[PDB]
Design a protein around this ligand. Sequence first.
Ligand SMILES: [Mg+2]
Ligand SMILES: [Zn+2]
Lengths: 49, 97, 49, 186, 50, 48, 79
Amino acid sequence: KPERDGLFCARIFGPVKDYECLCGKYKRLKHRGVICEKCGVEVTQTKVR
Amino acid sequence: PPDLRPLVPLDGGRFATSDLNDLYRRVINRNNRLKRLLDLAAPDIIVRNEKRMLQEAVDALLDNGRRGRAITGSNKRPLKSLADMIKGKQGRFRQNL
Amino acid sequence: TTIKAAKKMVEREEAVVWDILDEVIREHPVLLNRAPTLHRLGIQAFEPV
Amino acid sequence: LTDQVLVERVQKGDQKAFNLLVVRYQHKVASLVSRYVPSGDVPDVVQEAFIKAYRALDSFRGDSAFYTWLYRIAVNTAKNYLVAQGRRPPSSDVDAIEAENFESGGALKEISNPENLMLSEELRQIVFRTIESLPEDLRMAITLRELDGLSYEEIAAIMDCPVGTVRSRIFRAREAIDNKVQPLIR
Amino acid sequence: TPEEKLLRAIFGEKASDVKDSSLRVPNGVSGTVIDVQVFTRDGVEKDKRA
Amino acid sequence: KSDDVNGRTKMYKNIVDGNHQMEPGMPESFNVLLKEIRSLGINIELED
Amino acid sequence: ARVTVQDAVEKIGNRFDLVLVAARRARQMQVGGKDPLVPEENDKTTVIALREIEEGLINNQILDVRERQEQQEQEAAEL
RNA sequence: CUCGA
DNA sequence: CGGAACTTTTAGTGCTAATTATTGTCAAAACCATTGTCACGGATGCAG
DNA sequence: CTGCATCCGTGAGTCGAGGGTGTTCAATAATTAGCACTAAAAGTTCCG
Ligand SMILES: [Mg+2]
Ligand SMILES: [Zn+2]
């Protein structure tokens, strides 16, 4: 898993897996396009990175 | 972007790594130490040598081999800078376009 | 009907793909290429048999 | 000039006194640490040893000279950097251009074919036709469950049904999906 | 694969299922198996063939 | 056949449907070169 | 039968618009369900289009007025 | 490092 | 296909114990390869 | 102020095959990776 604010991140560049956040709280299609409570990552595909 | 300089787990002890990552880590470490030295009221020559190290890291990251001595990470071989990733017979203008 | 059955029929190597292969390479030329290419006559077109 | 008057002056408050020590000792420290750490990362750990020597000069009791103190600080910072590098992944182990054309490449190569995407769209069309041609209550339950992520209590309150018949409906919908989608995956 | 990625995006992530990642014969070669060598780390149980 | 992300899939869909018709699109390795040049201090932009 | 293309070059002496008009005719034959004028011998649309160039009924002038006539008749029948 | 062109 | 008993889990609370990065330094403290390629332009110092 | 000569940056073909490595003191202050305990929600057979 990448670091919180290092060279490899999630809130700066994007999510690692397709339609799955880093925390694992939001994984369904209903939460597609919203951020979390602590990480703050817009969940999307891996092509954003 | 991290998709252009990937760092991935390779099966077993081996890891697959890009060259630029170490230079980026050195630049980030020198910038953090330069931000921490100016607050604690350091003498002038310590932050002067820190600025010299940061300038050496910056112009080694931009084009390695144009300074007074090309720095190396391992294998007695120079690391591949962003200018070295364009030039040569392995850059984008000769291999992938 | 689907492409999965056609893929399985191609992979199984039946005797019903061969007349289709003779039908699609009737007048379909291919480009041949030499790995050293000095002048323009190293890349020509030919009809396969 | 000796070093006792200089360390007494910088303990007294002279900020321009440690420079005369560092311009006499920095080449010796940069030559000492370079035997333990690699030659590319010498000035960061040498200057970090200099910072940790400047920030702990009041604890110098004066039983010895400054050179053995700076020597022990330099070797300890070199071994601490070696430990921190042992915790870090290697920086130049395997090149990335020699990684795609190699066995067991996870993220260098991707299993994405134009025939695979067309087969994925065909399986999507097949499972969308498999969702249809069903009774309305099972289709309504499976579209309220697996297309929205709702819980069992909302489906039990909306459809006017208990929990167990919703479990039976989603089990029947799942086997009605899996009797068709599983022969297409082989 | 995308045919598994679509199923995982619709109804997946249970974690019980296992993918088929096995060693297979390459396309073109047709050989006869004459020797099987099995090396095992200490502390790991072994099957009957080993 | 080599570079387009959304061009080879549409060409594969059009070939099996009986339509020899391609789309130009845009290559992706040129975007990699654009991101590599843009990572330096040199700005490069595509106009109207 | 297609082994030479030299007479089609002698018809339209540019050797670059021949590929354009043949691709236009083969696209009108492949996409749209049109009738080939020359009788076929179970050949592809490339051979049929090249033989239509060879017989002199198809060039860069017939296709434009044919598309204009098709547009005029579809605007008349659009109502 | 090496092999054929 | 409609129901309750049966059974298996992916999420929320904690809690102790290996991974994290820190403090010390106070007899003194002799140090990487290179080195067996060729051929252009042109910005540089002397050095009159 | 018109030239001398001394270095410093550029480069030196293409297409396939096999095989792939890094130079360590002690003792801790916080710190987070397993892991027990519920959670009935969610999943899986079974009787009309
Ligand atoms: Mg030969
Ligand atoms: Zn999250």
